[PDB]
Design a protein around this ligand. Structure first.
Ligand SMILES: O=C(O)CNC(=O)C(=O)O
Ligand SMILES: [Mg+2]
Ligand code: NI
Ligand SMILES: [Zn+2]
Length: 331
């Protein structure tokens, strides 16, 4: 078995290897990459996502989210308070302000220490989940707006034609903006490209150990667990590396820099934080190997998780027994 310790693997495809996206994902899996839950892909030196980032300031962040924490430094939840609209240029100025800017630090490990010590005492503002793309239309390789759709994959594997669409999302971050512990909708893959700015640190639990993280989370968030049998679908709970180590949960960490892709694999729990002003693009995708994960994915039916239009068909076809309860949660 390849990669039996479930380490995060880093790949350096050549320009020739960068042509066929599906084939390269399958290659990475042949080397055991998926066992970690997360992989990094450094694009060939010849590749670029677009020519420059000099003209993005007028993108609108219609609903910036202030991420307010509750709990203790290593075990906390966050809620999202909606703020007034602002442009990307206005958000960048805010990120760079004395109130929100990255503090002085020695290296990524020192900044990580400071994050976990101090995150809860601040409320950073995240421009998350903005439909759109920064890839040039002429970028033919690893263009996250031109990937094969999940609906087409389901139809190719299973024969059933379904409604729905699959488009990318932009994320504008600042110091301490936080992504809570989660797997993707329907335990899909994700791919994330860091277009510009400061890094993003990731934590990940191997898919084969995801239930260990779930059991810890039920212990640490006992009211939330009574409320919902899949409350990590709410995407609000944080647990630090120190607390994971104290509880014997297997995990890994890695820092993504501008110009790099990360892939999350089915049922790979992940969480993380941004180092400073940045912009990322991400989308969900599927492969043949996903189908079995999609059939077994947990679901939130309490009403909190509320998701896209296109998840309806995935539940309806892959999980017909669960469909009626889940749809009630949507309505
Ligand atoms: O970058 C972020 O805030 C969160 N991204 C992801 O969870 C992802 O790409 O799967
Ligand atoms: Mg613009
Ligand atoms: Ni994710
Ligand atoms: Zn729920």
């Amino acid at each position: 078995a390849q990669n039996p310790n479930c380490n995060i693997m880093i790949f350096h495809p050549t320009k020739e290897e960068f042509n066929d996206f599906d084939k390269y994902i399958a290659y990475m899996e042949s080397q055991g990459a998926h066992r970690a839950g997360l992989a990094k892909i450094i694009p060939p030196k010849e590749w670029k996502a677009r020519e420059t980032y000099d003209n993005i300031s007028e993108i609108l962040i219609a609903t910036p989210l202030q991420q307010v924490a509750s709990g203790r430094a290593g075990v906390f939840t966050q809620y999202h308070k909606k703020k007034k609209a602002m442009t990307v240029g206005e958000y960048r100025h805010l990120a760079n302000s004395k109130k929100y800017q990255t503090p002085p630090h020695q290296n990524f490990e020192d900044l990580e220490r400071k994050y976990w010590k101090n995150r809860i005492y601040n409320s950073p503002i995240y421009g998350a989940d903005i439909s759109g793309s920064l890839f040039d239309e002429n970028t033919k390789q690893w263009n996250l707006g031109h990937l094969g759709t999940i609906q087409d994959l389901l139809e190719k594997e299973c024969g059933v034609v379904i409604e729905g669409v699959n488009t990318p999302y932009l994320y504008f971050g600042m110091w301490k903006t936080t992504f809570a512990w989660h797997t993707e909708d329907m335990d899909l893959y994700s791919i994330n490209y860091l277009h510009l700015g400061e890094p993003k640190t990731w934590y990940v639990v191997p898919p084969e150990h995801g239930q260990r993280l779930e059991r810890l989370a039920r212990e640490l968030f006992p009211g939330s667990s009574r409320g919902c049998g899949a409350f990590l679908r709410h995407k609000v709970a944080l647990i630090s590396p120190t607390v994971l180590k104290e509880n014997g949960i297997p995990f890994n960490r890695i820092t993504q820099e501008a110009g790099e892709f990360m892939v999350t694999f089915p049922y790979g729990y992940h969480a993380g934080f941004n180092h400073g002003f940045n912009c990322a693009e991400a989308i969900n995708f599927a492969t043949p190997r996903w189908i079995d994960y999609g059939k077994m994915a947990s679901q939130c039916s309490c009403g909190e998780a509320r998701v896209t239009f296109s998840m309806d068909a995935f539940v309806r076809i892959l999980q017909p027994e669960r469909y009626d309860l889940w749809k009630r949660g949507q309505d």
